[PDB]
Amino acid sequence: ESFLLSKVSFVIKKIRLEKGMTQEDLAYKSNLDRTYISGIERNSANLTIKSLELIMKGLEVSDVVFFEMLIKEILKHD
Amino acid sequence: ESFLLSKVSFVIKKIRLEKGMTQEDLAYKSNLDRTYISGIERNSANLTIKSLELIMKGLEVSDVVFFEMLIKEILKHD
Ligand code: NA
Ligand code: NA
């Protein structure tokens, strides 16, 4: 897993926890099942753009805020 | 179910999410299985004191902090 794949997983999980959400709440709100959410948060290699859009909606985060949090994580830690 | 039983379950879940843990992470660290953790989060009626001590250990919360969070929930919301 490259730094980018680990940090896409990292930012999904970080926002989910910031929001007080379980994996099962995010599964329900993203229309992707709980094993799929757990899998993505471990390795985001095969997460598709369509599924990332569903997860941003289920986190109630805009795409701009999600990608800004990702860029900050890359800049300050890669 | 009474406010007490609901609030034991609420406080367990609240600390679990504050610790960034899934139900499987907590099951593993408490030595109680995932279905047992999920059942007591729904309804703590049959949670024993010994299982509660295993859970507080798996959350790495002291019994004093656990019970102080429960009293603050009861006072503020009941
Ligand atoms: Na996908
Ligand atoms: Na559950």
Rounded CA gap, A37 and A23, in Å?
Answer: 6
Q: B64 vs chain A: nearest CA distance in angstroms? A: 23
Q: How far is the CA of A33 from the centre of ligand 1 (A)?
A: 11
State whether B20 and A17 contact (CB < 8 Å).
Answer: yes
Contacts of A23 in chain B (CB under 8 A): 22
Q: Which ligand is nearest to the CA of A23?
A: 2
Rounded CA gap, A6 and A15, in Å?
Answer: 14
**Which H or E element spans position A77?**
helix A63-77
Fill in the amino acid letter for B70. L
CATH number, domain containing residue A17: 1.10.260.40
B17 vs A: CB within 8 A: yes
Which tokens hold the place of A18?
């910031």
Rounded CA gap, A64 and A22, in Å?
Answer: 23
> 3-class SS at A8?
helix
Q: Which ligand is nearest to the CA of A43?
A: 1
Q: Which residue's structure tokens are 């019970």? A: B67
CB distance B58 to B26 below 8 Å: yes
Residue-range definition of the domain harbouring residue B14 = 1-78
Number of domains forming the structure of chain A: 1
Between chain A and chain B, the number of residue pairs with CB atoms below 8 A apart is: 10
Contacts of B20 in chain A (CB under 8 A): 13, 17
